[PDB]
Nucleic acid binder design. Structure first.
Length: 963
RNA sequence: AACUUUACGUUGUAGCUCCCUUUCUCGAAAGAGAACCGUUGCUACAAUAAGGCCGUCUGAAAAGAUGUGCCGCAACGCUCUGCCCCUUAAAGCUUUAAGGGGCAUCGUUUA
DNA sequence: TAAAATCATATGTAAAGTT
DNA sequence: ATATGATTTTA
């Protein structure tokens, strides 16, 4: 078994890992295995919405439609019973036969006349169906609702129906809303008033069925809709005292040597003041700039304290959170003796599931769950690791908004950098080479420092700015004791002045403690200088937490890192030094060590760089930090000229072992660093011979655990999902392969127009439309926003055109909407593969074929449609079944191709595969589109572990069912 | 992360309706009448994943009534189930048995 | 040709609230 | 990203 350190680089859609041996004193000595794990991040890629959004909106809509349908069913039953309809009015399907299709006009007429049973029924069903809007600043629909309400009772109109007809047919031509207008909505209260008024009139005129029974049934149906909805409710004495106290007890003051909570007398002074006084934070230190506290319940009742008690306060808190109305709240309060809500919350060898109560971001939950997968795979394979080193990406834990904000920020800063480099080139025309980062930064610091050597105030000649050994960008506070590479820690000073500083802060160097003249001049310099406030603050740090600062800069206090260190240190058997065995690297320090150790990247081409930073942070042990700190300290105050401790004049960074970058880059990429267009060593034989080959002096790089990197991917072998696309097209013409869809005029372009159904039936319409689209250079949304009519054979305009039909090609459907419509398909959960006569046959299995349980009986032939497709019987040998991201290999004479199954072409009978790391030196983004299967020799799906180990073929027996 | 409703949109079928291709009759032609389609606009009813169910009342079952009726595009996991893989051990490739893991058509959220 | 590789185009949406 | 009509290239 091994003593090893497992490094992890965690992303939103990838987890890279590596294992590095340690010697007894925890130096890096050897590298074993390394891997990547990719999946799909837990959100919709392009719109940032949740993954369950589609499912919940589907649920909401399903329930809405079934509840409305059921409402109408109950209304028909009620009609039949209270005596309006006999059994001759209804037909076989329980649908009232012979309905008047003229309900609005009947409503208006219905307040002057005795109506026969059928039209009374029609209006009643009409009101139940479209039942208006209920209560449950700005407006869009609410504006239209309120406008019609105002018109209806702050005007001369009788009633909503009548009003609607005249007003909406006088200046719109259409009663109902269309295409996202909301002005013709109605308040349910106004529909209710219209209903009662109609009942009065039908009572008056002698309508037979205007009974109390029908009135209650109909009215209740119209108005009734479901009302919106031992753990601790928060607005309770027990909960607010706790939120006050437990969040108070971790407030720390930076003391002389350590941090300290407030003294028992200090905490006592203001424990009871949020009780005794209404308010605070800025006045927390005024007694002992955000809020940080307010006692909501106690002070709400006050606004001389109040005289209540906990048992009563606990009961009123519970009663107000479980109930909303006056009704039940008074009940429990009445026995016991304002608005409340928002209830309160209340070692092995492997890692237990990530607590979804503790972790409530889906992206982070998925990333950490695959992190746990990788961790347990590594453990079961190699035994318990000594240390777990974690480096989690910057975008982990952030909202979609925040991620986008940062994406924006980095584009504008890249534009800025190009502009600044242009200025620098203009300043330095004869500059041999191109601007590097430190040169541009030297220019910025010159401008920022006012062209003054911030340590001496000497004017800096710009001509010599980029002279080797004239100006140097400095670590104001030194790097040995603080590990600060940050931009606020850098000031541009001459080389003449920065040679006797040592590793001293300016306050220990300019004798700031005796407030000497040099310190006064210096503080003035940086104060007036163009640096931000943060920079000025850190340049003049007087005394600080040496150990605190270094720990701060090596450790990430992000929530996910905090929790992850805590959860992997508490609930996991780690063979490490008991003090602190999990480590969350700082982003900038990991970046520094990668860039200084030779793995400065190739900027996202293939999917294996995650292993790079996993390796870089695996190696950040305390012994390595020792070595780096000694080296940096030395170089800080020279001492690199003939001397010795316990010192050659050209010593660069203490890398873990000699030839770190070479070995690591070979193993991770199979090619030597600097040469990414080599011949990849995709075998053990090539990789091991290349490691014994290229690396002469390192025979410790060839052992029995050297395996090439094969990225593992998320297996999504679900058999549920979307049934069909939500655009329903007519199937009347599906005999010949077409289907007609009403395309609205505002969004039909030339290509859509050419397929217009009546192109040979209104050459004047076709011609006007073609003419107009060509006239406006077809941008239809603007080109048809001017009402366009239908001119006669020899005459004036007659009829508006608001949408026109278009026939589109179709050879597949999904018969939806009661076999009345055909829709497109969307999800191919599976592809069953058969082999007869050394030929390979593909059988797509979709997700409606699963809902019905259809096991398809037909394979795919190119060009021929489903009715002329090869049938599959008992003569076909079963091979395997492919789901998305199933590792498959296909061998033919041309090539051998090995990857993850991604697509199956329905038309062409081909399948597409992704490469393991989606590389662009192969295919289209590493997706291999269009692969032969019928003419090939070998076709078999394999296995994959999360690590990449244990890749072995598959043979299946009995063909599985679809349900 | 759940939950109520609304208003559209799409498909189907009706009544009216703006255009119009062919086919039958009347006419010398000019024009008319019609039919089956296609389809512009308006209104209404049915459906609004594909698929599966419940409960209450008369009933002897038949079978009829009835409901603020219900689930179905996700995350995670291994208590149960299915597949696949890995070990381990015994006998003549399977069997038995024990164990472990990956993923789901399995389980919880969830009705 | 038949199969394999390539290219190319279409995917439902606003509102109002509640816990 | 998926699904799939339509088109070109190849044994």
């Amino acid at each position: 078994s091994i003593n090893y350190i497992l490094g992890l680089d965690i992303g939103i859609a990838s987890v890279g890992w590596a294992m590095v041996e340690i010697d007894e004193e925890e130096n890096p000595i050897r590298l074993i295995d390394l891997g990547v794990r990719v999946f799909e991040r837990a959100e919709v890629p392009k719109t940032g919405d949740s993954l369950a959004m589609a499912r919940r909106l589907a649920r909401s809509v399903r329930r809405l439609t079934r509840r409305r349908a059921h409402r109408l069913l109950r209304t028909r039953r009620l009609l039949k019973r209270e005596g309006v309809l006999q059994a001759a009015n209804f037909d076989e399907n329980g649908l009232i036969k012979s309905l008047p299709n003229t309900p609005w006009q009947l409503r208006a007429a219905a307040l002057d006349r005795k109506l026969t049973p059928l039209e009374w029924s029609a209006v009643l069903l009409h009101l139940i169906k479209h039942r208006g809007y209920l209560s449950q600043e700005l407006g869009a629909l609410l504006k239209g609702v309120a406008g019609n309400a105002h018109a209806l009772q702050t005007g001369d109109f009788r009633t909503p129906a009548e009003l609607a007809l005249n007003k909406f047919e006088k200046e719109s031509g259409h009663i109902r809303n269309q295409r996202s207008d909301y002005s013709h909505t109605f308040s349910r209260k106004d529909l209710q008033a219209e209903l009662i008024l109609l009942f009065e009139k039908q009572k008056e005129f002698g309508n037979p069925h205007v009974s109390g029974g029908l009135k209650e049934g109909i009215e209740t149906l119209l108005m009734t809709q479901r009302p919106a909805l031992p753990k601790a409710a928060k607005n309770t004495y027990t909960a607010e005292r706790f939120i006050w106290l437990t969040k108070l007890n971790n407030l720390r003051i930076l003391e002389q040597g350590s941090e300290r909570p407030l003294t028992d007398t200090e905490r006592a002074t203001l424990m009871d003041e949020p009780y005794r006084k209404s308010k605070t934070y800025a006045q927390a230190r005024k007694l002992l700039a955000s809020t940080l506290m307010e006692m909501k319940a106690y002070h709400a009742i006050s606004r001389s304290p109040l005289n209540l008690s906990p048992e009563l306060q606990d009961e009123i808190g519970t009663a107000f959170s479980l109930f909303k109305t006056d009704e039940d709240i008074t009940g429990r309060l009445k026995d016991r003796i304002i608005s409340f809500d928002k209830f309160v919350q209340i070692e092995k060898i492997y890692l237990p599931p990530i607590p979804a109560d503790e972790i409530r971001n889906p992206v982070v939950l998925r990333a950490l769950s695959q992190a746990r997968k990788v961790i347990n795979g590594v453990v079961r394979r190699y035994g318990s690791p000594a240390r777990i080193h974690i480096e989690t990406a910057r975008e982990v834990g952030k909202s979609f908004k925040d991620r986008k904000e940062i994406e924006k920020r980095q584009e504008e800063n890249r534009k800025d950098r190009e502009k600044a480099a242009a200025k620098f080139r203009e300043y330095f025309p004869n500059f041999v080479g191109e601007p590097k980062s430190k040169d541009i930064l030297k220019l910025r610091l010159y401008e920022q420092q006012h062209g003054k050597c911030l340590y001496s105030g000497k004017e800096i000649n710009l001509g010599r700015l980029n002279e080797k050994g004239y100006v140097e960008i400095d670590a104001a506070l030194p790097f040995s004791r603080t590990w600060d590479d940050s931009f606020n820690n850098k000031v541009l000073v001459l080389g003449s002045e920065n040679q006797n500083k040592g590793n001293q802060t300016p306050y220990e160097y300019f004798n700031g403690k005796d407030n000497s003249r040099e310190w006064q001049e210096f503080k003035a310099r940086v104060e007036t200088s163009r640096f931000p406030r943060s920079k000025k603050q850190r340049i003049l740090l007087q005394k600080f937490d040496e150990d605190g600062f270094k720990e701060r800069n090596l450790n990430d206090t992000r929530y996910v890192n905090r929790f992850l260190c805590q959860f992997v240190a508490d609930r996991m058997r780690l063979t490490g030094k008991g003090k602190k065995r999990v480590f969350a690297s700082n982003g900038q320090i990991t970046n520094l060590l990668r860039g200084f150790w030779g793995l400065r990247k190739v900027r996202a081409e293939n999917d294996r760089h995650h292993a790079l930073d996993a390796v870089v942070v695996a190696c950040s042990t305390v012994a390595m930090q020792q070595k780096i700190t000694r080296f940096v300290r030395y170089k800080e105050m020279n001492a690199f000229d003939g001397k010795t401790i316990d010192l050659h004049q050209k010593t660069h960074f203490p890398q873990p072992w000699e030839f770190f970058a070479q070995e690591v880059m070979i193993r991770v990429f199979g090619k030597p660093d600097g040469k990414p267009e080599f011949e990849e060593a995709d075998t053990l034989e090539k990789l091991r011979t290349l490691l014994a080959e290229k690396l002469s002096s390192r025979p410790e790089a060839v052992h029995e655990y050297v395996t090439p990197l094969f990225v593992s991917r998320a297996p999504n072998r679900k058999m549920s999902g979307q049934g069909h696309m939500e655009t329903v097209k007519s199937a009347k013409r599906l005999d010949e392969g077409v289907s007609v869809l009403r395309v609205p005029l505002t969004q039909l372009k030339l290509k859509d127009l050419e397929k217009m159904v009546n192109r040979e039936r209104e050459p004047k319409l076709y011609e006007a439309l073609k003419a107009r689209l060509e006239a406006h250079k077809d941008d239809p949304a603007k080109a048809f926003a001017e009402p366009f009519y239908k001119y006669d054979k020899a005459g004036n305009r007659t009829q508006q055109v608001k949408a026109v039909r278009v026939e589109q090609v179709q050879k597949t459907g999904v018969w939806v909407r009661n076999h009345n419509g055909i829709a497109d398909n969307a999800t191919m959960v599976r592809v069953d593969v058969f082999e007869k006569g050394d030929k390979y046959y593909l059988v797509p299995i979709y997700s409606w074929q699963v809902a019905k349980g259809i096991l398809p009986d037909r394979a795919v032939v190119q060009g021929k449609d489903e009715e002329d497709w090869q049938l599959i019987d008992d003569s076909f040998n079963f091979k395997f079944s492919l789901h998305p991201n199933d590792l498959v290999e296909v061998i033919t004479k041309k090539a051998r191709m090995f990857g993850y199954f991604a697509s199956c072409h329905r038309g062409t009978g081909n399948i597409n595969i992704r490469i393991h790391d989606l590389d662009h030196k192969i295919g289209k983004n590493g997706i291999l589109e269009g692969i032969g299967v019928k003419t090939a020799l070998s076709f078999q799906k394999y296995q994959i572990d999360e690590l990449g180990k244990e890749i072995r073929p598959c043979r299946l027996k009995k063909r599985p069912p679809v349900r």
